[PDB]
Amino acid sequence: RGKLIAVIGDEDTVTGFLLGGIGELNKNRHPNFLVVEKDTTINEIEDTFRQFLNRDDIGIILINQYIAEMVRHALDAHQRSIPAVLEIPSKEHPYDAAKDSILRRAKGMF
Amino acid sequence: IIETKMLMGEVMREAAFSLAEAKFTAGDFSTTVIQNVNKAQVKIRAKKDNVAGVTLPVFEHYHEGTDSYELTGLARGGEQLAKLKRNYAKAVELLVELA
Amino acid sequence: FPELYFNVDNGYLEGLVRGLKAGVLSQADYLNLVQCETLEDLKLHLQSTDYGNFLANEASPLTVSVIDDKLKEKMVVEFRHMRNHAYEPLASFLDFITYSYMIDNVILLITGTLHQRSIAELVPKCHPLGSFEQMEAVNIAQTPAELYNAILVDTPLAAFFQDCISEQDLDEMNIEIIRNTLYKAYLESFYKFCTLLGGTTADAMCPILEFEADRRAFIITINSFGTELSKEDRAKLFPHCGRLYPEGLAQLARADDYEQVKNVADYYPEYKLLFEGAGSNPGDKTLEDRFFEHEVKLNKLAFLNQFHFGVFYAFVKLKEQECRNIVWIAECIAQRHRAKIDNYIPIF
């Protein structure tokens, strides 16, 4: 079977990847993304993250690097081998390796 | 991994700035994009390697043809929106590899 | 001609909107803004002009998205004020400005309703220049057919639908075909209105509205090449007002590559200079940037008269371009991408 990528992020980043063709609705009408409006609570972000990592259709989750640091508890607690998670930069937000949970494991890294 | 993150950062910054050019000529096109969703133009498949006696999971990028945003900004801004879709559509394939 | 009646109802509003026209950023003002290093400086520079206190009572960690909202907030408060103060000859004209926004708001309403979303969630996303007075369409929201009937009852737009789009068309056409088809009926209707307001209004408005009709035709053509739209669907969307209407409109509808579109622009020296003036190469001004630049050069001609409605429409489109300019400066500064900061359009 196939899988899809999913997004948790700001309106601009979500808009970008939607024109990049990322956007789809599950059969239950739920999207494969959350637009994190400034008014959104941490519980909506974390619930969406926990839904996306447990969902059958989603293979990869993309999280804006600043949102990844908000949801850091669940993001570091996620330790399944298959469903991947990516912390990504954005225009008013941090760089691509900020606190990165994978890079911090390696002995061979500089 | 380190090299792929280094590649991703600059492409993402260029894509994130390119959206401002669309926001200059196409107005708040973002609301129409976000509101109107049905089916993806790009999706993935899980795949394996068995090297050194162990199964390693990986992904490949696939394309479904149908542009669910084809007419967006037909009236104005469509030049910028055509650059914009291509920039994030390029970024996704590096994400699938990075994952 | 106009002076027999114009100042009787409009003399105050003319002096008001000309006052607001003095309150614009010159080239010399933009040549201050682009020098600064952060949104705190952008605030401190804009604070010196008519934008004073637009970022008062707001969060210290500024974002370009807040600057964008507070720039529009100024423009929409100034417009709603002029619309509340105007008498029916001007007020019907000011309403014709607002249709260009209500169309896009109706596109959201139809889009959300076709996805079964409650319209009450779309209300905060509607452009303030196109907000409705009658709300039963918004409150009911049950089905696309129910919304279409509620639109015809509640909305000023009802006449445009009856000329071009049935309920059955709304069920089948893409929302972007709807956007441009409503807009076709709109621009032609507003141009007809400006031809009926003869003399100085017609002579200030027709150069602009005839250019907007040509501008849609050019841009829709070059954007259609990669798409499922037929030559008939292009012809169905090109506005019939512009200088191209006798022939070039049909020639664009036949055309399917950029050179064939320039072969239309070659017959019209303004448009020949617009296409010649942009290859859209790396570091060039784009075709789109030249249309926005030229639209400003036309809007600047409105204030070279004294007694006509062309100033109100040109003013709205110039302050809209001022919002687009200051947002584009704010992006280039905030993202440090100074290489394209000069791409604002020098309004006055």
Side-chain angles (χ1 to χ4, degrees):
Chain A
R1 296 185 300 140
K3 293 190 179 278
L4 56 71
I5 184 163
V7 186
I8 301 180
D10 60 286
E11 185 200 320
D12 295 14
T13 301
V14 172
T15 296
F17 288 105
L18 286 176
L19 289 176
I22 207 155
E24 181 155 302
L25 304 188
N26 181 284
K27 63 177 181 179
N28 72 0
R29 298 290 303 280
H30 200 293
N32 69 325
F33 65 87
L34 168 64
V35 176
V36 186
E37 299 190 320
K38 68 175 185 67
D39 298 349
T40 306
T41 185
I42 185 59
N43 298 326
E44 292 171 281
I45 297 166
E46 184 174 353
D47 181 38
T48 304
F49 178 77
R50 289 178 185 282
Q51 287 167 334
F52 290 0
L53 75 90
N54 287 302
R55 264 173 65 173
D56 180 45
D57 52 356
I58 295 166
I60 303 169
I61 303 85
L62 185 66
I63 310 94
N64 176 319
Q65 181 59 83
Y66 176 67
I67 303 306
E69 191 59 11
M70 294 176 64
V71 81
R72 176 58 62 205
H73 173 66
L75 178 58
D76 290 5
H78 176 59
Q79 292 299 324
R80 305 189 190 277
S81 61
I82 296 171
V85 297
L86 299 178
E87 306 187 37
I88 191 174
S90 178
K91 63 169 175 191
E92 292 178 327
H93 299 284
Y95 71 99
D96 55 273
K99 299 172 169 171
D100 184 285
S101 65
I102 303 298
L103 290 182
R104 286 159 61 196
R105 296 185 172 184
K107 290 181 178 72
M109 183 175 181
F110 306 112
Chain B
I1 290 175
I2 294 164
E3 291 162 19
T4 304
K5 287 179 179 274
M6 294 163 66
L7 291 168
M8 180 196 67
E10 187 60 12
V11 176
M12 181 54 179
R13 286 182 291 261
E14 177 71 347
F17 181 54
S18 300
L19 185 141
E21 294 184 26
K23 185 165 173 70
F24 178 74
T25 62
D28 292 327
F29 74 91
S30 62
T31 297
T32 291
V33 173
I34 288 163
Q35 284 292 342
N36 188 29
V37 180
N38 60 349
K39 299 297 184 180
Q41 192 180 39
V42 296
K43 294 176 64 178
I44 60 175
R45 185 177 296 161
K47 181 180 181 193
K48 61 180 180 179
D49 184 4
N50 69 358
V51 64
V54 67
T55 303
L56 305 180
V58 299
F59 301 102
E60 293 182 336
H61 176 285
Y62 288 86
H63 191 284
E64 304 306 323
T66 297
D67 183 1
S68 58
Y69 297 108
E70 180 173 290
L71 301 184
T72 309
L74 181 77
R76 75 287 203 193
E79 291 285 11
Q80 291 77 35
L81 293 163
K83 289 189 177 185
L84 181 59
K85 63 180 279 198
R86 290 195 301 262
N87 288 349
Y88 283 93
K90 181 177 178 179
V92 171
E93 185 164 29
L94 295 176
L95 301 179
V96 179
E97 178 166 31
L98 181 58
Chain C
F1 186 54
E3 305 101 307
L4 296 175
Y5 77 87
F6 180 91
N7 286 80
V8 178
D9 292 328
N10 303 309
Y12 176 57
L13 269 288
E14 182 68 27
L16 179 49
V17 74
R18 294 283 184 131
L20 299 183
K21 183 68 59 68
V24 300
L25 280 60
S26 71
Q27 183 169 12
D29 299 291
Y30 291 117
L31 293 174
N32 287 351
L33 297 193
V34 302
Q35 311 301 345
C36 79
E37 299 190 324
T38 185
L39 301 183
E40 298 176 43
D41 305 340
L42 179 68
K43 178 178 174 185
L44 285 167
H45 287 293
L46 293 170
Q47 182 66 6
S48 72
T49 184
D50 292 81
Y51 290 98
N53 307 323
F54 82 128
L55 298 170
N57 306 312
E58 190 53 86
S60 304
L62 293 170
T63 61
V64 176
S65 61
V66 169
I67 274 64
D68 183 18
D69 291 347
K70 294 300 181 181
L71 292 165
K72 288 193 300 177
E73 184 180 299
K74 278 282 172 182
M75 182 188 64
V76 308
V77 170
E78 290 164 357
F79 184 84
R80 284 184 180 171
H81 182 82
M82 291 187 290
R83 177 55 184 91
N84 290 343
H85 279 269
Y87 294 96
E88 191 152 39
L90 172 60
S92 184
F93 179 95
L94 294 182
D95 288 339
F96 277 105
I97 296 159
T98 63
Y99 292 81
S100 69
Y101 301 99
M102 289 182 290
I103 289 165
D104 291 328
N105 292 350
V106 174
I107 297 311
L108 295 180
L109 266 59
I110 294 166
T111 301
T113 303
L114 187 61
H115 292 298
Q116 302 72 43
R117 187 180 297 288
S118 178
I119 295 168
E121 298 184 351
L122 300 177
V123 171
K125 309 301 183 182
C126 284
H127 193 301
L129 294 184
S131 184
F132 297 150
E133 302 310 323
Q134 299 303 334
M135 299 298 285
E136 300 303 62
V138 172
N139 295 327
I140 294 163
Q142 293 301 290
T143 69
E146 183 59 27
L147 175 62
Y148 180 81
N149 282 266
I151 286 169
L152 296 177
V153 175
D154 294 355
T155 65
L157 273 296
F160 297 3
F161 281 96
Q162 290 300 309
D163 295 350
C164 65
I165 296 180
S166 70
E167 182 188 306
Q168 192 65 36
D169 299 313
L170 184 154
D171 287 339
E172 295 175 10
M173 294 176 174
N174 183 282
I175 67 180
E176 293 300 340
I177 295 171
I178 297 176
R179 192 194 307 273
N180 287 283
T181 298
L182 290 176
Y183 196 92
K184 182 183 186 302
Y186 159 65
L187 188 160
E188 289 170 21
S189 184
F190 185 25
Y191 173 81
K192 185 173 180 179
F193 184 88
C194 289
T195 61
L196 294 171
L197 277 59
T200 51
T201 301
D203 286 343
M205 288 301 300
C206 291
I208 296 163
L209 297 185
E210 292 189 357
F211 180 81
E212 290 187 19
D214 289 326
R215 178 181 180 181
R216 291 288 189 269
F218 281 112
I219 293 173
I220 292 169
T221 303
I222 64 185
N223 289 336
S224 294
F225 299 159
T227 77
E228 290 178 11
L229 299 188
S230 69
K231 70 177 183 178
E232 293 75 16
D233 302 306
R234 285 192 292 280
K236 285 173 180 183
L237 297 178
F238 297 161
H240 292 183
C241 308
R243 293 176 184 187
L244 272 59
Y245 168 69
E247 179 66 354
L249 185 147
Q251 188 67 359
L252 288 182
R254 292 185 287 260
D256 63 12
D257 193 9
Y258 278 82
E259 292 201 316
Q260 297 159 44
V261 173
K262 187 175 180 297
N263 296 343
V264 178
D266 289 338
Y267 295 126
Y268 299 96
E270 288 88 337
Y271 306 153
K272 188 178 179 184
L273 293 180
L274 297 191
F275 282 86
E276 182 183 317
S280 311
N281 294 309
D284 198 15
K285 287 189 163 172
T286 67
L287 290 162
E288 287 280 18
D289 302 312
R290 292 301 189 176
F291 288 108
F292 281 101
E293 187 169 84
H294 193 81
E295 183 162 308
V296 170
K297 289 192 182 181
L298 291 178
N299 285 330
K300 286 179 180 178
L301 302 191
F303 76 84
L304 305 181
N305 197 274
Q306 281 260 317
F307 307 122
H308 70 114
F309 301 158
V311 69
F312 300 102
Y313 181 92
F315 171 75
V316 171
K317 300 298 289 175
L318 289 163
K319 299 294 281 183
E320 184 172 71
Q321 188 56 43
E322 196 159 69
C323 298
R324 300 300 169 68
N325 288 349
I326 297 162
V327 172
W328 178 260
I329 289 168
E331 290 290 346
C332 298
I333 293 174
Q335 303 193 50
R336 295 68 160 182
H337 293 302
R338 291 180 177 283
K340 294 178 170 167
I341 198 162
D342 299 347
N343 294 358
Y344 61 84
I345 305 304
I347 58 177
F348 196 71

